[PDB]
Ligand binder design. Structure first.
Ligand SMILES: CCOC(=O)c1ccc(OCCC2CCN(c3ccc(C)nn3)CC2)cc1
Ligand SMILES: *C(=O)CCCCCCCCCCCCC
Ligand SMILES: *C(=O)CCCCCCCCCCCCC
Lengths: 5, 283, 268, 62, 56, 62, 50, 268, 132, 5
């Protein structure tokens, strides 16, 4: 999925 | 944990002093630079700092495509007595001066490389014929591989060499290259030789150039117009732009202060006086 | 320290050699890195290394040079300056590969009535400029490697005009650090200053620096030592003073790979 | 596999973090754009390379 | 390619003692040599060979 | 249906696995790009094709 | 073929190997577009006899 | 062993050198003692020792000699035979003190139709007899130390009559082991026999033996290698046969003390 | 083995034929694959196969050739070299299709005073060059 | 959804 930072 | 785009330290308010602590007095003989801020020598107010060193990060300093060479090729009439010109370029950042100077602020470097190709063409004679759209082949020939001798010989088959087929008028061509060095980092300077002169052996056999390591460091780019000979001659130029991405650098050096004279650190007579006249007591 | 210890008074001991100094200005460790042996994670030649320890890693004193008002500067290259020094040199020439760190101790004392300041610079990869305006990269191995004897800086670029029998040597102009860059910026390199009113010496600890974990010591110098008079020597009223500069260097953590027969270089 | 990161917003509209999205299309790292998410270090190895740590208020030589 | 900067070194063979035969035996014989790579051997940067070509 | 895989990262920026994403647009496998996620095998069938397994420290012939 | 490594015949140190055979995999060896032929065609004037 | 291992087939590896033998007669370890470094409890010079490890402790092959029906015997002294051998020799000459053990591998092959037996003896303190009947203990250092070249035994004592310019050399009579004792008893010394029908070689592992823990290697030899034909060489019907004998020796566990400038001996 | 077994001494038996050898240098199994019959998952002609077993799978000895100092080399092709060999050949010629594996045993003895080395190669698809 | 690897 989305790897957030 | 300090990011490049983090703000620099705040100025702290500082008052008067009558003390035995001496921040202003030091001894540069030690090899150290005195770590002083304004509140050590003058009274300061509180400032909340917002400025950042983001744009002077090594990536940011080099994150620009720089021109490293201009290759010339052509496609003549079939009837001419001169051969159709294909271009051969020994790959380097040292044929132009600007990016070379920026990289030479450091002794060693690692980077991935982005190569972008701008291709322009024009007519040579006051002739009135035409040319249909040209396709260009940019072949990388690594050291060992057969270098082309003719615009149309077997080597241009590229079964294993990487080639780019560029169509005139389309967006400029672009490729990425990994870190390809046989060392753990690219050496911007090599204080040495590639051969040892041995007593027992003749002078001629032991000789090599100062500062030069692998004679054919990285191979060549060979460029040609794939189109067959046209009655009206067209000349074309390929400008190569290099951008060092994902870069790391080691051991800082002073910048080149006098004009570059060849691939090494050599300077030419007459180019050695860069500084202007200015008097000691003149603002 | 409360019971007498000081930044000016140092004792260094390596092998069977000890140096004392009563007038130092601390010590520099280049790039904050102390010398170390090659780690298994960075290793490359698979053969068991030769590590000479106390027989090579000790203080070798090179020939003393002389500082005068005419002195433009002096330079040395490492490992080249130590090539004929005891068992370090033998180990260097019997192996294809070698790596080493160094403790450099530059010695220059005078008196409370003398003046002068020496810039002692350690340059990684100190490539110098040659004497020619018609050809480039052409300094012979022999001229490039003076051994212990070192070389000197000149205040004037004077081009080798003999095209039929070229001198093939360097022509290192001092304000350009012999390499085309201005001397005032050489302070970004690891350095100390022997300012005669403050200290009798400079001490630099140098790590192995290279783009490779290990290399040919015979083909390649890793460090250059450059000593230049930042402020000229002066004494009382004597128009021609002189004081000695003695250079003492110790190899540190040196290891060697690829043993075979000894290299006999053409040095003349 | 979408990577989502923060922008450092300078000039704001008369209009809360703003983000941008990144997806790598290629198997080789060399093909990737520059992240620009870089780190800063302290200049000590160049500015203070001395063996005995310096205290700026004390005499450099003692 | 042949390059002094990345030169590999020298293989040579010698007689330690000498070949000894009895009488009624051939005094000359051949040895054959073989080369192969060890498990730590690798190659990189694919390129075209000079060991095949096509003039015309 | 997005396929997400790891890159072997060689030269790193002064900037944790890095991934890339793949989506197949076509019904026929032939249309697909090369994965490059390949396997290695041991050379034995070519280097040691002998019926009795060899022990390198022992005499090859006994 | 004798399966020897250097530690069988010489004294060796410990090396942590990082090299890979990735680029000599069968895919990698052939993953390049190679020229297999050059076809010639034309479009002449209507009036030509060829 | 059940899956092929044998007492006749050996492989020895030291440093970057390997020896294979398919026709050995086991190996001898002198006095049952394997070489070892000097223990702290038996130590005497207090300075940190130099221990060259793989650079010195490797196999050096000396000049091949030739066995014939006229051959009375050959001798060598250790460390003397290895004095010019690579970094072992350099380390030997740069230090006042040194100690070493050795692996001696004598090589001699022939054919199933040859005959002959060589006695390979390792003698601790092998003092040999000189050539004079008018003076005693007078063999010069130069004649006493032949280096790699070795010396030979004679079947006849022939006294140096030149009293004005004495030859000052040994005169080692073979049945008296060159020292006044009968050869038949030399078997109490560590030994092997190269009997050509049985083996191509002799292998002796020698400890450091001395009345001191460490000594001057330049002034004193610890071991002597004596090779004598116990049974003369014979082949088919040839009146004058020849076969080579190659001597290969490796230093083991060698350490050195008292580093200073190199010893340059008067060897001529 | 402890009670005498060796890599040099082999006995091979197929059908009514046995080969003994006291001076062998082990045996090679090509590409590590022992011969096998065609599996149903890889099968293609649907008709019941003929499998001659001991009548065809036995040792056929071909004409002996002679090695001399002038000898440049010899070659054979399979199944062709066995085409006239007993019931293997008959079975080969009566059917459109056939598959077979082989045990090849090359024999050459001399004496402790002779020298020479023969390279015995098995090439899959050994296409040879013609005379024109 | 996303087949990870
Ligand atoms: C020693 C001085 O020069 C350098 O350090 C230096 C110079 C050039 C550098 O680039 C690396 C060499 C090559 C690597 C491969 N390359 C390619 C590869 C494929 C194609 C189609 N086109 N170009 C082009 C450049 C990297 C470093
Ligand atoms: C992680 O990436 C899962 C979500 C992917 C969303 C679709 C990405 C956009 C299309 C990319 C196609 C593949 C490019 C090679
Ligand atoms: C699995 O693939 C589910 C997620 C899909 C995300 C959108 C993909 C990008 C658009 C592809 C369109 C179809 C291509 C034929």
């Amino acid at each position: 999925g989305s790897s957030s930072t | 944990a300090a990011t490049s785009r983090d703000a620099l330290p705040n100025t702290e308010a500082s008052g008067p002093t009558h003390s035995k602590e001496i921040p202003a007095l030091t001894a540069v003989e030690t090899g150290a630079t005195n770590p002083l801020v304004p509140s050590d020598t003058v009274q300061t107010r509180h400032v909340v700092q917002h400025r950042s060193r983001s744009e002077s990060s090594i990536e940011s300093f080099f994150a620009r495509g720089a021109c490293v060479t201009i290759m010339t090729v052509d496609n003549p009439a079939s009837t001419t007595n001169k051969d159709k010109l294909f271009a051969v370029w020994k790959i380097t950042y040292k044929d132009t001066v600007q990016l070379r100077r920026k990289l030479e602020f450091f002794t060693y470097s690692r980077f991935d490389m982005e190569l972008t190709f701008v291709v322009t063409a024009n007519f040579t004679e006051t002739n009135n014929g035409h040319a249909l759209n040209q396709v260009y082949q940019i072949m990388y020939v690594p050291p060992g591989a057969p270098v082309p001798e003719k615009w149309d010989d077997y080597t241009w088959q590229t079964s294993s060499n990487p080639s780019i087929f560029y169509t005139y008028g389309t967006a400029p061509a672009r490729i990425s290259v990994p870190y390809v060095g046989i060392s753990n980092a690219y050496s911007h300077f090599y204080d040495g030789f590639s051969k040892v002169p041995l007593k027992d052996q003749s002078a001629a056999l032991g000789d090599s150039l100062y500062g030069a390591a692998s004679l054919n460091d990285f191979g060549i780019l060979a460029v040609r117009v794939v189109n067959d000979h046209n009655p009206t001659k067209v000349t074309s130029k390929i400008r190569v732009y290099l951008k060092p991405k994902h870069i790391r650098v080691w051991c800082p050096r002073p910048p080149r202060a006098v004009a570059y004279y060849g691939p090494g650190v050599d300077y030419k007579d007459g180019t050695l006086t860069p500084l202007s006249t200015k008097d000691l007591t003149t603002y | 320290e409360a019971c007498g210890y000081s930044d000016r008074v140092l004792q260094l001991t390596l092998g069977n050699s000890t140096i004392t100094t009563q007038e130092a200005a601390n010590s520099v460790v280049a790039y904050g890195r102390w010398p170390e042996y090659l780690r298994d994670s960075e290793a490359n030649p698979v053969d068991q290394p030769t590590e000479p320890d106390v027989a090579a890693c000790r203080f070798y004193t090179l020939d003393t040079v002389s500082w005068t008002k005419e002195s433009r500067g002096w330079w040395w290259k490492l490992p080249d300056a130590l090539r004929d020094m005891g068992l370090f040199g033998q180990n260097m020439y019997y192996h294809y590969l070698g790596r080493s760190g160094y403790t450099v101790h530059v010695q220059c004392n005078a008196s409370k009535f003398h003046q002068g300041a020496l810039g002692v610079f350690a340059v990684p990869e100190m490539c110098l400029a040659g004497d020619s305006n018609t050809t480039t990269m052409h300094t012979s191995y022999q001229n490039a490697n003076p051994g212990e004897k070192g070389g000197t800086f000149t205040g004037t670029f004077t081009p080798d005009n003999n095209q039929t029998s070229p001198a093939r040597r360097f022509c290192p102009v001092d304000y350009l650090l012999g390499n085309g860059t201005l001397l005032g910026n050489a302070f970004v390199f690891p350095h100390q200053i022997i300012n005669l009113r403050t200290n009798n010496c400079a001490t630099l600890v140098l790590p192995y620096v290279n783009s490779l974990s290990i290399d040919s010591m015979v083909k390649h110098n890793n460090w250059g030592i450059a000593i230049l008079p930042l402020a000229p020597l002066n004494f009382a009223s004597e128009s021609s003073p002189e004081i000695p500069i003695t250079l003492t260097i110790a190899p540190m953590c040196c290891e060697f790979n690829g043993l075979r027969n000894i290299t006999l270089p053409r040095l003349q | 596999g979408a990577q989502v990161s923060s922008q450092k917003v300078g000039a704001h509209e008369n209009s809360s973090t703003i983000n941008y999205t990144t997806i790598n299309y290629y198997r080789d790292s060399a093909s990737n754009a520059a992240s620009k998410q870089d780190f800063s270090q302290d200049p000590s190895k160049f500015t203070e390379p001395i063996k005995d740590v310096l205290i700026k208020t004390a005499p450099m030589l003692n | 390619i042949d390059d002094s900067f990345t030169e590999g070194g020298y293989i040579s063979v010698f007689y330690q003692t000498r070949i000894v035969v009895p009488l009624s035996t051939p005094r000359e014989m051949d040895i054959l040599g073989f080369v192969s790579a060890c498990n730590d051997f690798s190659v990189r940067l694919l390129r075209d060979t000079t060991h095949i070509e096509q003039k015309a």
